[PDB]
Amino acid sequence: KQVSWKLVTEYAMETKCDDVLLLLGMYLEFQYSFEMCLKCIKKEQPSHYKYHEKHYANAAIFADSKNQKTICQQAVDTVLAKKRVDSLQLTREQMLTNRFNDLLDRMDIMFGSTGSADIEEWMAGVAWLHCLLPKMDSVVYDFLKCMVYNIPKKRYWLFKGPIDSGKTTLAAALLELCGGKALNVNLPLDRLNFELGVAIDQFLVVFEDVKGTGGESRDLPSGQGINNLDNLRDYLDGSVKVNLEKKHLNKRTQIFPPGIVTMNEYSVPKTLQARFVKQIDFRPKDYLKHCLERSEFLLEKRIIQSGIALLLMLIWYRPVAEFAQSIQSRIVEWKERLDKEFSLSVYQKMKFNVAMGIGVLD
Amino acid sequence: KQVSWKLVTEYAMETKCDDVLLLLGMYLEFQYSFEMCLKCIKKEQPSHYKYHEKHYANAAIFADSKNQKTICQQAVDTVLAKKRVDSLQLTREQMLTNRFNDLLDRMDIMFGSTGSADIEEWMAGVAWLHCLLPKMDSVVYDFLKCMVYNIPKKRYWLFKGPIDSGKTTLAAALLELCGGKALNVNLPLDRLNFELGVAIDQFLVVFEDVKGTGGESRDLPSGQGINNLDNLRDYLDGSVKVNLEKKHLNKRTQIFPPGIVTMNEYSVPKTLQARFVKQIDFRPKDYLKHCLERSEFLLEKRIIQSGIALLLMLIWYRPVAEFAQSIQSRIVEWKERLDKEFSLSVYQKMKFNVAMGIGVLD
Amino acid sequence: KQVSWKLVTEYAMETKCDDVLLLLGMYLEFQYSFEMCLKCIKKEQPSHYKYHEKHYANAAIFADSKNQKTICQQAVDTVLAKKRVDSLQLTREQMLTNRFNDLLDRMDIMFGSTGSADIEEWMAGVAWLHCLLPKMDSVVYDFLKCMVYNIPKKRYWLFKGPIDSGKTTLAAALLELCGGKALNVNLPLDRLNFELGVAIDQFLVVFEDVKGTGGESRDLPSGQGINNLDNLRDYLDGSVKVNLEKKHLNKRTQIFPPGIVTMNEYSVPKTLQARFVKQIDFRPKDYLKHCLERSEFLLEKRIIQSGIALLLMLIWYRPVAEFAQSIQSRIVEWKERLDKEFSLSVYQKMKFNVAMGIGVLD
Amino acid sequence: KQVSWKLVTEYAMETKCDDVLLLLGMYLEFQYSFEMCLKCIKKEQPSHYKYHEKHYANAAIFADSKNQKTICQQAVDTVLAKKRVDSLQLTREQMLTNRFNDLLDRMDIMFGSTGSADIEEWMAGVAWLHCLLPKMDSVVYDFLKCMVYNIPKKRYWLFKGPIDSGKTTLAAALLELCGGKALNVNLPLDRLNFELGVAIDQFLVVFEDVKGTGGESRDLPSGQGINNLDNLRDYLDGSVKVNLEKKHLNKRTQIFPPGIVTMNEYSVPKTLQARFVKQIDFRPKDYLKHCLERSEFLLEKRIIQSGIALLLMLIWYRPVAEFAQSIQSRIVEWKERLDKEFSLSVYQKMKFNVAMGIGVLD
Amino acid sequence: KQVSWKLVTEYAMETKCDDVLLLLGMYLEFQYSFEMCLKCIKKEQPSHYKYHEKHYANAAIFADSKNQKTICQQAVDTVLAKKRVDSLQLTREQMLTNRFNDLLDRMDIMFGSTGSADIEEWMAGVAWLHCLLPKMDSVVYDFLKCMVYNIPKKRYWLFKGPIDSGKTTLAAALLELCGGKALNVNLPLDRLNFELGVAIDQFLVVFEDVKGTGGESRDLPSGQGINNLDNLRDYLDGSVKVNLEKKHLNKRTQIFPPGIVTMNEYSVPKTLQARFVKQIDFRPKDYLKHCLERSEFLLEKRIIQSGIALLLMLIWYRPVAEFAQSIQSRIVEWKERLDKEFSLSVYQKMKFNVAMGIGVLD
DNA sequence: TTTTTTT
Ligand SMILES: Nc1ncnc2c1ncn2[C@@H]1O[C@H](COP(=O)(O)OP(=O)(O)O)[C@@H](O)[C@H]1O
Ligand SMILES: Nc1ncnc2c1ncn2[C@@H]1O[C@H](COP(=O)(O)OP(=O)(O)O)[C@@H](O)[C@H]1O
Ligand SMILES: Nc1ncnc2c1ncn2[C@@H]1O[C@H](COP(=O)(O)OP(=O)(O)O)[C@@H](O)[C@H]1O
Ligand SMILES: Nc1ncnc2c1ncn2[C@@H]1O[C@H](COP(=O)(O)OP(=O)(O)O)[C@@H](O)[C@H]1O
Ligand SMILES: Nc1ncnc2c1ncn2[C@@H]1O[C@H](COP(=O)(O)OP(=O)(O)O)[C@@H](O)[C@H]1O
Description:
This is part of a larger assembly, with five copies of chain A.
Chain A: H1 5-15, H2 20-28, H3 38-41, H4 46-49, H5 52-64, H6 68-89, H7 92-110, H8 119-130, H9 136-149, E1 156-160, H10 167-177, E2 180-183, H11 192-195, E3 204-207, H12 225-231, H13 233-237, E4 242-244, E5 252-254, E6 259-263, H14 270-273, E7 276-281, H15 286-293, H16 297-300, H17 307-317, H18 328-341, H19 344-355
Parallel strand pairs in A: 1-6, 1-7, 2-3, 3-6
Antiparallel strand pairs in A: 4-5
Helix pairs in contact in A: 1-6, 2-6, 8-17, 8-19, 10-17
The structure holds adenosine-5'-diphosphate (5 copies).
Chain A binds one DNA strand through loops.
EC number (chains A, B, C, D, E): 5.6.2.4
Cofactor (chains A, B, C, D, E): Mg(2+)
Main location (chains A, B, C, D, E): host cell
């Protein structure tokens, strides 16, 4: 009998696998007998136990084959081909809707019967995130719409505040909610060349902790990031296509993606201040610090950094009609799921605990 | 049965794909039944629904095949071969006539029944651009004439002026009309060679926002760009061929393209001013600035940066005889469309609105 | 029924193609029917209409083939193989005699019944070049002997003088007459390897617009050229075989070509001054500018740079006996055309016009 | 009806080709019929008229074949394989004996009645060059003896002296008398990897114009060469096998060959100074230059640089027993044949003409 | 029939052949008949006449084969693979056994029937070193066993003395008895990290001429070398694995090799003094200089500075039963050779005349 | 792999 190359390519497509060694290893685990597989019976990894039943007959023949890495390469090139087709043909609203579909799939497993996580612990995360800024759910929705519409010169937001105020916490959650990357522009103009190359085909970027110079009475390290941003003005404005470089690969011409700049209270040049739409001032708050000392599980599970928490915030607060037409069905299912388990009185009691600096789940 | 490699090569020539991954992704999705195909029913992308019914039989057999990327690589070689043949054998008037034909195909789709845009928005763009410089249609035409003749020494145009003065708006629109690339020569010398390699076979080059030295006299940043340009003087003149390189590929010998330099008001060494045949001064105009803020659809849809707008300007103002004899019959059809859907009073009112800082549609 | 690889090899040999993409593109055009081809009926490019009828049957079999680039790579290597054989086996007099035959073939097509060139406009170029230096045909003939005899350490010529004085003009014309490559040595030492590799198997090199270190008090830019070139002294002499390099290919060992160095009034080290035979000083001549300004057809058609203009000068002034024995019989045919289509007096009027700063033709 | 790969390998062994494009070009010329072959009738090159009649039948079938470059690779590999066998298994005296046999075969054909050269002008070469130094012919013998012994850590020679002093013409003459390759180590140390790779299985290495640090006040610019050699100490000592590299081929483990360094008057670090066995320093002379001005055939025909001129000198001054025993019978034929024409009285007269600066002839 | 690839691999294994083109070249020699072979009758090399009778049948088929280099590549990979199995097991004793095997075989040649120098020069040098330092025949055997055991903290020996005392000249011979490299730790601390990386995967390290501070009190130059070395605590002691990096490579983790420090007479901080297991003081002796001056061939043949002189000393004095139980048989022959080629009394005569300051062969 | 990256 012969290997079906078509069944391998299907598995790669449905697993969304970019990687020749990961695919090869995953697929070789299907050769052992289905009826007695310990990895199925512990139900431990979803990308195994959902597929082993189908692929056993092909995996047995594949284990005898001589072509193995050649079969996996064609499968991986098919998955890479779809990504490139999508990048050039989807509108930004569809890219975001696909990303929410990926997140909702992970939530269904994570809060399912074999799930590890309590939904009570993640709703405590929504209560703590809501106290970080005024009107958080509007701020998150304004951010999403701004990244979708991508209007020239209305592309970037500035996060400003003392050390330990929440800047990296909120930024990391937005990066997970709509996939993106972090950049470090504090380097010399020499090395920036490959640093800016991380943004190739990304939806969103964050410039993390850019350092100015001067203001030394404030007790701040000096660096050159603000000078660099002032020379990188064209990338922030975004009217024109710029050349971007990865190590060993040819230059690509792109409209550089929108993003977030985080900084301490360094002085902005009047030039740079004008490229931003909004600045959000973060300030330290004593009640939130006392709360985290008495609700450690938020930090230790990394709940407050995670985009699943921001999505649960959006699901609770925003009306169904703001979401795109195809995802609305999953959302009304998830709303009814949540309203059945959290009474509004319990959620207001969670928020009242956070405002008092007491532990959330008393 | 066996795959027809000839039909794949035919598809690549009709859609003009250079990317092997993009061609592979496109061709695979034809494998599903044409009678049901959702993107054909939705009329989503012209690169798909115009072809699916023809290629369906071959795409099913291609999905079974074991040398898919060898098939796609040969098809991409075939499209590259036509580009190099056309580059050595066509006169620059024919190269430009072919670029106008591509744009007019986009305009037929874009302003047809399937398309999203409409003419009164984009024609207000042509009214806005005409207020930027005196006699804009003569300046655009005289530029096109210069680039087609490509006379040595008498070859490059210099745009200078304060920030927010429309240099990059015009330069990006001229770039989109002719086709070409933007280069950032502000770099260190040891990596300029790969930057200049982006010019290979292009029709235009635009050297964007080159920094000088001595800017503190004006409160301007400092950078090497103007000194690098003084070392590249051989590339600007175009008297003799230069050697250009892409990463991992052997050097190619050709005459460097003509084009545009944009800069802030640095002092220019007189040996470089001797090499620029025309200098166009841009200055702040407050009425243009007020008009954009009240007419922001001009930015949100990128109407003012786009070469389709400049071609509509040429169609409105130029007499039919100045286009090459091949494309004239297609242009009189467009003059008829525009003179049907508009009147002089409508366009005279749009320019009247701009000149008073009123909204262009008021 | 199978492709004959020998027919493609003949076509490549008769056409002299060095790159695989160009050979592939040319040959794929032959698959369409000979009885209707528009490119044959217009007689537009001579590489097509002379060969299509012979190759058509094979081209349709080539278009079905699974192996196309492999076929073309063998054919291109066969053309490169002949050029390597001749570079070891021929004397330099025969190399130049062959290059003159190639030029005289182009002159038959340019000035034939089926081409655009006007012999009066090209003989107007001879008048302008004959004014640039005194005794111009003596200079051209002494240059040619220097390149043919290739006497060690007496091989290079130096051109000095202001910007806009005819030095790059005459260098480009000599470079087309002999054939060769133009090289840039103003970049730093560490990437010169692949630049000097452009000189492999060539007859001439021209080092364009070399920059010195000093002279800044004259308002002349500083750079690395003369420092680099003083390290390269071993390449200039041609007493010893050097090692030359291209990407992915092994070291070639050969004597480096003779050539021309061009520069703008920098001072030169005594070690470099010892390795040039003759220095030519160019000083601006006002009447040549006012002539050229009224004679813009010279620049558009590039006549004053073209090697054909110096070959026409040699046919006008030199005796017949001092061309090689096989090419004399074609030169005497060209002597007769020029004495039929011009008198002396029409040529003497043109040369008087150039002295007067009037347009060359009147 | 198959191509004989055996016959191609025999042609490469008899011609001793070591480049694939050259062998391909040479073998393809044999496909045309033997009878009418214009090159065989004129007898232009021995590598053609010796072999065509034998190889014709195989070359016609080679011209139909489609593996052509793989056939030539296996033939060139066979020739490179034999040189490595010789390089290990021959006695080092016999390698020099073999190289003289190659020269003595080549010297006989060029002084044949069919040859272009003549005895008196090449003996003027012997006269001029023996005048260049004190006791020249015994200095050449001392060099040959030193290289033949190759006593570890007692190999290399220095030369030192200024421009136009004579060092490089002597080094070039020795290089052709032996087998050898010139190297340029003035480039930065990390690039030298493939430069040193040329010495693989060579007899002599010569380092030409190696530059020190400082001394620039004499108009002798600096470079990395001497610091490189002090790093490359392990290769001069060569008491152990070094590892030498070339592109896409398995690397060679070998002792680096004996050789010569030529320099201008730089300082030498004591660590490097200790490696060189002998230091034959140079001084300029004036009547020799007066003679060359009047005797231009010497440089035109490259008489003074060639190893044939030193071999004519060693034939002149050396006793016949000092050579190897196989060539002893050839050397008496050249001793006699040379004396039979060129008597000592006329030799002394023209040697006086050099000494007096007259110009050598009569 | 077909080629046996295993017969080729047997020849490569038994010849211990490391290199593809060398294997190809030697195996092709077996094409011709065994009975007639001229090399077999002369017996010039063992690698031919031992095998030709056996391998002739295969070599007749190998000559017709169309993929000869692939056969040889597999054979060489088989010999190279066996060296990496042996790397698994090498105890540091067995490293020194085979390091000696490589050096005796070069002694067998150089002093042999086909030799190049006579032991009467070498033995007077061995007698000279046997009076440079007290009891030195015991020192070298003790030194080597410290290196073989590589006991932590017991690793390093300090050679101290004023200039011209014998330090560098003995360090050369010990480094050539072992294998290793020298390091120059006088560099500023920034550059030391790359210098130390040269020790990657080696048996021995030698540190040369560490500059102190305060040595100007005796006109000694001063520098950081001692202060750098005092800070390399973990590299000297050898209890823990340390990181090493070459330029352009990733960091390697290993125990740092043992070694020798040679020092120009400065003071040593008592921290650094605790790192060295034994200190050797070298002192000027004028009778050693008079001896050298009256025996200058000792230096000019470089008798003193070789691992050959130290191995020859280990042969003379030490007993046989302490050499490894395999290699000890090869010292039987060099003992009996020396005991008969040289006189037990003549040694004492030349040590006497050395100590007398008389010429060592007088 | 070589080149590019690294230095
Ligand atoms: N608004 C706040 N008030 C008090 N503590 C905070 C606040 N936001 C965050 N923290 C504390 O600071 C830690 C780090 O927050 P992060 O956002 O990573 O720092 P930064 O604001 O400097 O980027 C959190 O884990 C939490 O313990
Ligand atoms: N005459 C003008 N006066 C003031 N602003 C202008 C004028 N023309 C264009 N603009 C502004 O130019 C902006 C485009 O950027 P641009 O000025 O071209 O950048 P740069 O000057 O760096 O090339 C537009 O967003 C618009 O607001
Ligand atoms: N006699 C002259 N006076 C002024 N300009 C001249 C003269 N001769 C040639 N030129 C100019 O030389 C230009 C070409 O450059 P050229 O002077 O040959 O080299 P470079 O600019 O490097 O010195 C032509 O476009 C032409 O305008
Ligand atoms: N005595 C001499 N007479 C004439 N020319 C000489 C003499 N010595 C050297 N040369 C010139 O220098 C070249 C090589 O000698 P060398 O002293 O090495 O010069 P360079 O230092 O320029 O290489 C010769 O080929 C020749 O052109
Ligand atoms: N103990 C000694 N007494 C006198 N001269 C010596 C002594 N040791 C070496 N020499 C001489 O000193 C020269 C330099 O030796 P070297 O090892 O460079 O000195 P150092 O001990 O400073 O390293 C030797 O070549 C030798 O001629």
